[PDB]
Every structure is written in structure tokens, then in C-alpha cells.
């Protein structure tokens, strides 16, 4: 499921918003400019099972 | 071995997917802080199961 | 017996107001062996963290209840 979401990323982007670094700092903001998997987790099919 | 079989199964991944797994028994937030923050320090892990 | 009660503020003068109200609570209608020690924490600069003092400092000191303000800006 995650790899079809990542393939839909590689369709609609060619880059990935990386995970955060530390739990102990907030550097700039939480601006999700590269648009994480919530439209990309919409369509997932595997092996005859949606 | 399950990850290796999933990798050799299908949809052969231009992304080099790498998985870090552990076994615990805790409902404990310091365990959450240690495990989660140390894995976020390590290479910014992107998937969660 | 010893009941630790937390407080989340931005200041510490009102944390001392909590401490003096704990003194009042030991005086008023509630008595007497030893049942209270003082715990009071300001707001943290990293809003990710927010539980370091709680587990390391409050739950480790067995805090039953925490009295929480909005934020250090209180409007974000």
C-alpha cells in the first residue's frame, strides 16, 4: 500500500517531502509544500484486493 | 525475511525501501520518545507499521 | 499521601501563587501529616516536545493533576 502511494508520488511528483529531523526543534514551519500521501493513499489496489 | 520476500515479490521499487522493526510490550510514552525520536534522527524514516 | 499537582503557565510568579495556594490548602480544611509537594512548569519553546517535563519530571514525581494555560503567546 505504501509503495503504491509512493509510486503515485513518483507519478505526480518526482521528489518526496522528507520526514522531520528531531523532536526538539521547530526550524521554519510545518508547511507541507510537497503534499504528503492523503491524495496518494486514495487509490491502492493489490493482487485483486482493493 | 518477510521484507525480503515482499521486495522479491512484485512492484520492484526504484525507491530503495529499508525497514527497521522491533518487538516490545509497552504502552509507554518514554518508549515512544526514545524509539521514535532516535529513528527520526536516523535517516528520517518515512513509513510506519 | 504525597500528592503532586502540576501547573502549566508561562510565568512563575503565578506558580508561586499556586505554591501559596497549596499552603492555603494545607491550612484550609485539609490536615495533617504531609501530602503535598510543589510542581509547576512554564510553557516550552518547542511545541513538539511538551512531555519531557511531564514524564521525566511530573509523572516521575507522580503528578495527579495539571492546571494548564493557553500558550506563551496564548493566541497562536
Swiss-Prot record, chain B:
Contains an N-terminal domain, a ligand-binding domain and a transmembrane domain. Agonist binding to the extracellular ligand-binding domains triggers channel gating. A hydrophobic region that gives rise to the prediction of a transmembrane span does not cross the membrane, but is part of a discontinuously helical region that dips into the membrane and is probably part of the pore and of the selectivity filter. It comes from Homo sapiens. Component of N-methyl-D-aspartate (NMDA) receptors (NMDARs) that function as heterotetrameric, ligand-gated cation channels with high calcium permeability and voltage-dependent block by Mg(2+). NMDARs participate in synaptic plasticity for learning and memory formation by contributing to the slow phase of excitatory postsynaptic current, long-term synaptic potentiation, and learning. Glycans are attached at residue 25. Belongs to the glutamate-gated ion channel (TC 1.A.10.1) family. NR2A/GRIN2A subfamily. This is Glutamate receptor ionotropic, NMDA 2A. It is linked to Epilepsy, focal, with speech disorder and with or without impaired intellectual development: An autosomal dominant, highly variable neurologic disorder. Features range from severe early-onset seizures associated with delayed psychomotor development, persistent speech difficulties, and intellectual disability to a more benign entity characterized by childhood onset of mild or asymptomatic seizures associated with transient speech difficulties followed by remission of seizures in adolescence and normal psychomotor development. Rare genetic variations in GRIN2A may be associated with susceptibility to schizophrenia, a severe psychiatric disorder characterized by hallucinations, delusions, disorganized speech and behavior, cognitive impairment, and social withdrawal. Changing residue 7 to L: Found in a cutaneous malignant melanoma sample; somatic mutation. It is found in: Cell projection, Dendritic spine; Cell membrane; Synapse; Postsynaptic cell membrane. Heterotetramer. Forms heterotetrameric channels composed of two GluN1/zeta subunits (GRIN1), and two identical GluN2/epsilon subunits (GRIN2A, GRIN2B, GRIN2C or GRIN2D) or GluN3 subunits (GRIN3A or GRIN3B) (in vitro). Can also form heterotetrameric channels that contain at least two GluN1 subunits and at least two different GluN2 subunits (or a combination of one GluN2 and one GluN3 subunits) (in vitro). In vivo, the subunit composition may depend on the expression levels of the different subunits. Found in a complex with GRIN1, GRIN3A and PPP2CB. Found in a complex with GRIN1 and GRIN3B.
Swiss-Prot record, chain C:
Component of N-methyl-D-aspartate (NMDA) receptors (NMDARs) that function as heterotetrameric, ligand-gated cation channels with high calcium permeability and voltage-dependent block by Mg(2+). NMDARs participate in synaptic plasticity for learning and memory formation by contributing to the long-term potentiation (LTP). Channel activation requires binding of the neurotransmitter L-glutamate to the GluN2 subunit, glycine or D-serine binding to the GluN1 subunit, plus membrane depolarization to eliminate channel inhibition by Mg(2+). It comes from Homo sapiens. This is Glutamate receptor ionotropic, NMDA 1. Heterotetramer; the NMDAR subunits are modular and harbor tiered domains that function in concert to regulate opening and closing of the cation-selective ion channel pore. Forms heterotetrameric channels composed of two GluN1/zeta subunits (GRIN1), and two identical GluN2/epsilon subunits (GRIN2A, GRIN2B, GRIN2C or GRIN2D) or GluN3 subunits (GRIN3A or GRIN3B) (in vitro). Can also form heterotetrameric channels that contain at least two GluN1 subunits and at least two different GluN2 subunits (or a combination of one GluN2 and one GluN3 subunits) (in vitro). It is linked to Neurodevelopmental disorder with or without hyperkinetic movements and seizures, autosomal dominant: An autosomal dominant neurodevelopmental disorder characterized by severe intellectual disability and developmental delay, absent speech, muscular hypotonia, dyskinesia, and hyperkinetic movements. Cortical blindness, cerebral atrophy, and seizures are present in some patients. Neurodevelopmental disorder with or without hyperkinetic movements and seizures, autosomal recessive: An autosomal recessive neurodevelopmental disorder characterized by severe intellectual disability and psychomotor developmental delay, involuntary and stereotypic movements, spasticity, and inability to walk without support. Intractable seizures manifest in some patients. Belongs to the glutamate-gated ion channel (TC 1.A.10.1) family. NR1/GRIN1 subfamily. Glycans are attached at residue 37. NMDA is probably regulated by C-terminal phosphorylation of an isoform of GRIN1 by PKC. Its phosphorylated state is influenced by the formation of the NMDAR-PPP2CB complex and the NMDAR channel activity. It comes from the Eukaryota. It is found in: Cell membrane; Postsynaptic cell membrane; Postsynaptic density membrane; Synaptic cell membrane. The gene is GRIN1.
Amino acid at each position: 500500500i505504501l509503495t503504491t502511494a509512493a509510486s503515485s508520488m513518483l507519478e505526480k511528483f518526482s521528489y518526496i517531502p522528507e520526514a522531520k529531523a528531531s523532536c526538539y526543534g521547530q526550524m521554519e514551519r510545518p508547511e507541507v509544500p510537497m503534499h504528503t500521501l492523503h491524495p496518494f493513499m486514495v487509490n491502492v489496489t493489490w493482487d485483486g484486493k482493493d | 525475511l518477510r521484507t525480503l520476500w515482499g521486495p522479491e515479490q512484485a512492484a520492484g521499487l526504484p525507491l530503495d525501501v529499508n525497514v527497521v522493526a522491533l518487538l516490545m510490550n509497552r504502552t509507554d510514552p518514554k518508549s515512544l520518545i526514545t524509539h521514535v525520536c532516535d529513528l527520526m534522527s536516523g535517516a528520517r524514516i518515512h513509513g510506519l507499521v | 499521601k504525597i500528592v503532586n499537582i502540576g501547573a502549566v503557565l508561562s510565568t512563575r510568579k503565578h506558580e508561586q501563587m499556586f505554591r501559596e495556594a497549596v499552603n492555603q490548602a494545607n491550612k484550609r480544611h485539609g490536615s495533617w501529616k504531609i501530602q503535598l509537594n510543589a510542581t509547576s512548569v512554564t510553557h516550552k519553546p518547542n511545541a513538539i516536545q511538551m512531555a519531557l517535563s511531564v514524564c521525566e519530571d511530573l509523572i516521575s514525581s507522580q503528578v495527579y493533576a495539571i492546571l494548564v494555560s493557553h500558550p506563551p503567546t496564548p493566541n497562536d
